[PDB]
Amino acid sequence: HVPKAPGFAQMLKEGAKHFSGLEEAVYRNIQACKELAQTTRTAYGPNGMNKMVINHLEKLFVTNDAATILRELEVQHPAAKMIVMASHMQEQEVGDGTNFVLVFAGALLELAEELLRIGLSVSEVIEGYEIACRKAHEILPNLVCCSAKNLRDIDEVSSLLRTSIMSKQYGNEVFLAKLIAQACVSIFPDSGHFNVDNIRVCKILGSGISSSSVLHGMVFKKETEGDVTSVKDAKIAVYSCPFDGMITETKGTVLIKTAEELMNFSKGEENLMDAQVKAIADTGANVVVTGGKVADMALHYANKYNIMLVRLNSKWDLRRLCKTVGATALPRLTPPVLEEMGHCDSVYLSEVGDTQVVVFKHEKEDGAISTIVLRGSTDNLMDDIERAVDDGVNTFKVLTRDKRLVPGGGATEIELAKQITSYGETCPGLEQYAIKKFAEAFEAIPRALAENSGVKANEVISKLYAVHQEGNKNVGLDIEAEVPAVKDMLEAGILDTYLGKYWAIKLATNAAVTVLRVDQIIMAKPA
Amino acid sequence: TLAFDEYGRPFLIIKDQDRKSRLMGLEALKSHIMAAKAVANTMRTSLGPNGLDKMMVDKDGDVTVTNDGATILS
Amino acid sequence: MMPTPVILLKEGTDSSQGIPQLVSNISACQVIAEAVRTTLGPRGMDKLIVDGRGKATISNDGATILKLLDVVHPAAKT
Amino acid sequence: HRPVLVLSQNTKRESGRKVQSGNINAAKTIADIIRTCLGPKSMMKMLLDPMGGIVMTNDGNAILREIQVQHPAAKSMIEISRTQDEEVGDGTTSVIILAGEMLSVAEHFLEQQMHPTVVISAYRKALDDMISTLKKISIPVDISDSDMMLNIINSSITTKAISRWSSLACNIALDAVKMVQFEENGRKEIDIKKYARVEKIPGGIIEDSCVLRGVMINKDVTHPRMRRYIKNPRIVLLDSSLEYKKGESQTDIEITREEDFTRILQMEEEYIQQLCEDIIQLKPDVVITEKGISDLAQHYLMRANITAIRRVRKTDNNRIARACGARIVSRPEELREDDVGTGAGLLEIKKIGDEYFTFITDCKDPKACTILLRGASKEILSEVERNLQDAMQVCRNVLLDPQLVPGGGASEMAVAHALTEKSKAMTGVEQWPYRAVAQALEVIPRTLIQNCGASTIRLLTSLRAKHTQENCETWGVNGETGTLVDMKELGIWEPLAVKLQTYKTAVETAVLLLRIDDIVSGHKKK
Amino acid sequence: AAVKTLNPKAEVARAQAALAVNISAARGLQDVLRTNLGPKGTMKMLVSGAGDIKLTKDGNVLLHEMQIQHPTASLIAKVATAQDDITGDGTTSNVLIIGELLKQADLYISEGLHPRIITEGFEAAKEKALQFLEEVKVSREMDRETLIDVARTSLRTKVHAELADVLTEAVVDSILAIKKQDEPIDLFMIEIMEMKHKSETDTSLIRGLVLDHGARHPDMKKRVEDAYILTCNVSLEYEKTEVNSGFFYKSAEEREKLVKAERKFIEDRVKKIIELKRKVCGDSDKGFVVINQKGIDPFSLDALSKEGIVALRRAKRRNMERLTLACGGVALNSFDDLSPDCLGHAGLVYEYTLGEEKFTFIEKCNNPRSVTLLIKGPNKHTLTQIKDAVRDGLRAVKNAIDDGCVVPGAGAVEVAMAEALIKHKPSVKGRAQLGVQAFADALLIIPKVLAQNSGFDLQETLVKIQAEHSESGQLVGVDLNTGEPMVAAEVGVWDNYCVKKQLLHSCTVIATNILLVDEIMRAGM
Amino acid sequence: AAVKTLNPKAEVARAQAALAVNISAARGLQDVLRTNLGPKGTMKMLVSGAGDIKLTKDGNVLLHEMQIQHPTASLIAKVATAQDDITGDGTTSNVLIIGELLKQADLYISEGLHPRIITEGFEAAKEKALQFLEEVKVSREMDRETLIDVARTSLRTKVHAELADVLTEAVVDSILAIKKQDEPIDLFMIEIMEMKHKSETDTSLIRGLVLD
Ligand SMILES: Nc1ncnc2c1ncn2[C@@H]1O[C@H](COP(=O)(O)OP(=O)(O)O)[C@@H](O)[C@H]1O
Ligand SMILES: Nc1ncnc2c1ncn2[C@@H]1O[C@H](COP(=O)(O)OP(=O)(O)O)[C@@H](O)[C@H]1O
Ligand SMILES: Nc1ncnc2c1ncn2[C@@H]1O[C@H](COP(=O)(O)OP(=O)(O)O)[C@@H](O)[C@H]1O
């Protein structure tokens, strides 16, 4: 009766699919990456919306940063993973602009579909995108108007860090800018390498964001097991061995042969531990922090000679304490410490937010390390501010590597859209269509800023080209109210991450080119 | 409606809410009295010197004839 | 009937969008507010929550009632 | 088991961007199926039927009717090609590509936070300007000329599979419409479906196929003594039976005497001989009816030298009534001289492949003809039958509207420059969707070069520059070679009713599918 | 694919995929059907689901009774159906041209070229192949010795050459005594009866008719000489009125009067028959045979048996057409104008019983113009061998009488046609130069298969045949006994003109349409 | 069949059947691997069951990471494995010769001839082709500008010719500073480290070592 079509030449798979051509492979990779660009388009900008994303571990992640959203979404399309790993490389390089990659490369592949269906194949759209990408790296040093050079203190960086804060925390742009100014400048290495790992976030559940502060030191979440919690001298002896004595390594066996060696063994072990605790009490130590466990005999002489004990079960937190108070973790049992002692100002305990913490607070010598103690009503809010805190530390490392800045908020992408269109009209070849489409991908980036603010993007994008008549080069977007009448970005102070714009254009161009190189897809059976 | 929204989305608040039981009403206080009166009507016949005993059987089959109110309800 | 691709979106995930999402979050917070609504004021009653093991916990505190409801809604966990 | 307190059980709800941008992808999917079936360099598409048959064709209407889709917006595009198939002949594949392209540019404006009513109000203003452009570039046709009408039907079958036998299929389709063009009262009508029957017989060659001057049926004579070759027969068409049947009553006869039973059996024979004597008063030669003929009626027509055909169909009786000029009567005692089919030519009972065929041909002025198709098998004869139906309807549109539009890409580019010059005086938010209608018409010259393998960049830049001047305005795309040849020299001309129905249906398909922002599925009915 | 998005249960084939489906399936039908072309082919035993044996090797019966479910195989089976419908032979050679028109074209389409360029070369090669076929046909004025060699060629290729000497005398002598004076010969006048009497090599040609039903009364004569055929169409059995009437009687004496009166109209038809026997001078033997297409009740059979009239019943529809020409009477539908002018005549009318199944024989006619081939095959499957070969041979001699020219035999046509396309290959002057080469090499499969089934070499035979054609003017062919090139016009191997004309037309159009197919898909669910 | 008699669960292929199995499978691997030969070839994205992207177009990586279960496809994959083991390049061109040696021989074996007669002509053609290869080889005394053009040909057929100018200076300059005085060059002395620092067009040649 009804016939059917069998295999033809190479149907040898056991349950796997195959894609070949432009319509089955190239056009389907574009439409799959277009859905990720339309997903994070709402969360882009200062007026972006959050997204409650639940992973496979059945926990809640609510954020507006596009980097942490893609880590929880279990994407299975292969070409869609290329735009996720390109956004993950933006977080590892500069730490800001991960969403800029999804909008630009999502518009590069979308406008490439209009070129393959009207004209040139992938051999000339790719070569056309590479010419406009090299010309885009020549306009970005010409768009630099300000620099983070004069008065590197807490006053100038309080305004230069507001752009990375207001894109994810719009209402808290003033409080979080001052908290990131008293923490990043205080750990300055005196013209050296700025380490972003020297800033920790201690999430304390409690009151709102107005009670958050930055403490010069470290705040832990453990106990003391003692009664010497009030320490004012703060001479800290840091150890990595377990503070319970010196045991052997191979087997361990007490060998008793007479009645005198049995009775004197218990009293001789207590006198041996008594001589080791009093050896560090005569050196002036007050805080003894160990990594391993602590026996009951070590706690007996810790309270007798009035020294405080701190238990640190994490081995990574012990190395950060050595850079906090300026000490060295000794692997052997307690010696007379010559010069590797710690020196803090005040080590105390306080129950803040129904959580007994241990604070190594520096008062006079303020700059050795910083810890931003964040407060919040929910645990999900403190994770979102911590992402905004880490975007402020990563922006400070960008200004250490390169002090140049470009006016953001839509002012950079319009001038990049005007100069590439000028190079496209002066190219007497067939690849000038991809150069004109490369400049229109920069046009869609302030389009996402106006659609998230409830403003019509047609009237917004028309006023940007009207005020960019060859000499302004700075007017961006005013998203404070409807009927914008947009203003200057240097007067408002919206400029951030010139090095972030240098890498996000390069990564999104290489991501969109790599998708267009894929002509034949051979997948396996998922298991 | 329950387990569905007005926009067509599934409306799930707590886990396994279809197999739950919730009574606020006016019979939630009435269900507490009728459950407590049947315990008091059982212990009413075992009060005083003419109070008749009760035969209690354990889970293992052991039988204990009790009259005190502590071991009966336990 | 609309989405039928050869490669799906992520695995099988459903996601609401826009104005029906926001009213879905507001009406979800109204249901979980009824478990602390009758516990306010000196003329407020208490509530009894029984888990799967049969352990009864009668209380009127908001930190005690809401932790025993086992709410799995994302907006109602706030 | 307690029921769940729900509302609108077992149905779906979907709104927002997933329905507006979801119906575009369903329209782009159908337009990519028949995209390789527009130019003259097209290829056939073999289809498989649930009955077990095979439809090997390249016509855009016959492909989409064999596709069962589940998407609701995909079901709308199939009914568009069914509308274009009934109005005109060769107006099928062009509307589905054009409606997919007008929705392709409509998806761009839906992402710009523009309301769909603004795009439709710009589509209706653009639709009213495409009708006025085709009426200015048209050309009057001399319908009395034979060589002018052959060039119109050759332009419609160059895409189809009968372009190889173009010298034969043009003469068949032209003579088929000019025979069935009947006008009794003051109203001209052309019925090429009820009177121009296209019968196919497996065997022979395609070059021996010709339109007969008359009708033909697959029916043998009722008796071998009847003549199978009459020079000039007088055909009498009947509708009732020549038998003895029960009346529409409760008739019952009580037989008490001996002579009563033999009398009723004799009155049944005299009743048949009475109606057989009433049909021989006009001296006929051929008696054709629709119901059965008893053997008592075959005996009286045998000795009267009358050839009788038994069970001719009702649609075949209406077709032979126009060819021979006879009247289909339903009463043998009410026959008149006007009901006799005089003027009929040669009648011959031929045999084509071990089966008799009754031929009634060589008529004086027949008003209904039958196209005799003979080919290799029934597979390719269904292709020529579907192509001649697209070849006779494009001749019907010229005889009712003698205006020609320069096809082959010259029709779409003459309006796309007219919409571009008229868009300069818009000065509003509807100016940009007005420009996209002129860019959506570019998909018809895009398809003619993508099928032959030509370049789409070097050709469309030169073709758009040819319409910048108002003098030439008729330069199209030559699908045979792949260069730009003027259509006044090639001879590719499409009728006005084909191009007007193509533009009116492709816009209103985009009008319907853009106002859809919600889809409810899962409910039942009666 | 686009069809997978709309319908998820719809398979599809792309441009380079659907071409490999149709070509590899055409090689599947080619490699099976090439083992039966010519007299050296092998017999194929075809068993259905019931278990009956269909032993035949005709190309039309092989394609229909084959358990294959493929869309490409259904297209070739429809072209093969019309080849065995209008002209008989030419079905096995039909499939082998399509199997080579797609295989020789695959060598160019896979090597960069477009399939439409090959189809443009097929039309230019078909125009030269049609003109060359009209130059090689031989008009021999339809001699009766020429029609023997035409029927011998079509019968050898279906039997083991011991029955081909018997069936040629039964086919040629049957087709000559049907119609004269340039009249189209109707093949319905030849009856084909299947018997089981002696053996397969005993099929004779009865000059009259052989009816498969006998006398339905034991008192009738079994052997009747010098008979009168009365062909009737009336119903002698008891029939009622069309209106439901019934009977009504009062006494029992009036009951028997109604049974006598209800048969009066029946016996009036029988009294017209027995009075016709008395008006033809019945003072002799004077046998009477009534074939009587409609049924006869046993009351009228008992009345006709007492007068000595053999009466048959339940004849066929065409038995009133074949016996009317054979006996020379008039097939009447009534008994109102009975006369001796409508009576027939046969010298011998006898019957014979073969396992409780009588067979009425009518022989010894003057000018019958209607004969009957009496196939007497031993087995049931052997009857299908002879019947499918008789209609293959009857349609071969019918085309040789209607067409005025005869076409030569095995390799005298296909080799000479392929050499004519080589010298006219630079005449196209374009990209279709390789299309004429693919058409010329596809026509050479007929000497290649005949050299392969006979056991000879394939390439070594085609060199010697093309050498004798290029160095002479005689249309040389293939010899299936020695392998040497022998002329087919002299050894008595002929063919039909309409078979070779349709082989150049039906195979070429179905090859140009298959090569232009790139979207094989199954939708509609 | 005889193998079906003793073992009923044992499929078999006859003389004219097993030839069509190997030829149709050789054209299956030929039509896939012919779209990536040379610099103008197309890239292939290979996804395994885990979900990792393996974007490459080398003939050895394509045949190994392909969902194919065929005995003829496993024979060509064994020959393609030894091509990329001893001399590197020449794996994509290896499969196309095997796919054409069976396709060109299919036109003669199906036309009456024996498969052994075709194999007698392959050996007589291989001896003349091997002697012709020794006459067309060009000796240029191993100049460092000659090795640039040798490395440029092999690198352009695996990258988009922007990294081929960078990797040529990293391959030729790395192979010269290993051994001198006509000594066999050991490829184990070159370590291949994978970083993520800047970009794909930043691969430099460290003159010492890089430890992970
Ligand atoms: N005050 C402001 N006015 C206008 N636009 C702003 C303002 N602050 C931030 N933006 C815009 O919001 C966008 C936020 O981008 P973001 O999501 O941080 O990129 P990434 O994901 O790469 O970090 C920037 O492109 C910037 O132009
Ligand atoms: N020789 C030719 N040169 C250029 N274009 C042609 C030629 N022949 C046909 N065409 C184009 O091919 C198209 C075929 O349209 P078609 O699919 O037949 O429409 P429909 O489906 O309504 O019948 C026509 O619009 C015509 O412009
Ligand atoms: N005696 C013979 N000698 C040589 N060739 C023959 C002979 N008889 C038949 N042939 C060849 O066999 C071929 C096929 O014959 P046949 O099987 O009857 O027709 P088909 O193959 O179309 O069914 C013919 O083309 C004819 O040339």
Ligand SMILES: [Mg+2]
């Ligand atoms: Mg930011």
Ligand SMILES: [Mg+2]
């Ligand atoms: Mg057409």
